[PDB]
């Protein structure tokens, strides 16, 4: 495993819209074996996808369609890791 | 794997004795 | 650390055929608290 090699970070950890697909990236395969976990906590749905990149990276999102403050959970191998939980709020149509 | 592979199984779930220890 | 992760890789498509059914719940459950259980590379490919 390796929760403290796990790589964390995203335009969409930070802050998103409402109604607009919030991505981020959370990197950890080369810390080493362990499956991945995560709560993700919102006050509306949540649609999970995952997107391939040209680097091979990988990058999640998801969309939501309550505007205010969301929050998504983290978890690497089932262990909060530092910082947690991820406080991420949605704001307003970029406008 | 560690800790998690059992209590890893999000599922919130656990009739039986939690073994551990 | 190549291999034991993986491992309980199969052990959650059984696990489902032994349950068999299914689980969910939602509604009376205003925080959508739901989770991502993602195993090392997914279906589609990447490296």
């Known amino acids: ?95 | 794997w560690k800790v998690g592979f059992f209590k890893r199984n999000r599922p919130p779930l656990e009739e039986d004795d939690e073994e551990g220890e | 650390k190549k291999k034991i992760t993986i491992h309980d890789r199969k052990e959650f498509a059984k696990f489902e055929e032994e349950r068999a059914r299914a689980k969910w719940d939602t509604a009376n459950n205003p925080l959508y608290k739901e989770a991502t259980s993602t195993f090392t590379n997914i279906t589609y490919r990447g490296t």
């Open chain 1, 1 to 95: 495993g390796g929760a403290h090699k796990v790589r964390a970070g995203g335009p969409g950890l930070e802050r998103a819209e409402a109604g607009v697909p919030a991505e981020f990236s959370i990197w950890t395969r080369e810390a080493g074996a362990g499956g991945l976990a995560i709560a993700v906590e919102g006050p509306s749905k949540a649609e999970i996808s995952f997107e391939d990149r040209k680097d091979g990276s990988c990058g999640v999102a998801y969309v939501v369609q309550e505007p205010g403050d969301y929050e998504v959970s983290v978890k690497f191998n089932e262990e909060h890791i530092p910082d947690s939980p991820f406080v991420v709020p949605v704001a307003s149509p970029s406008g």
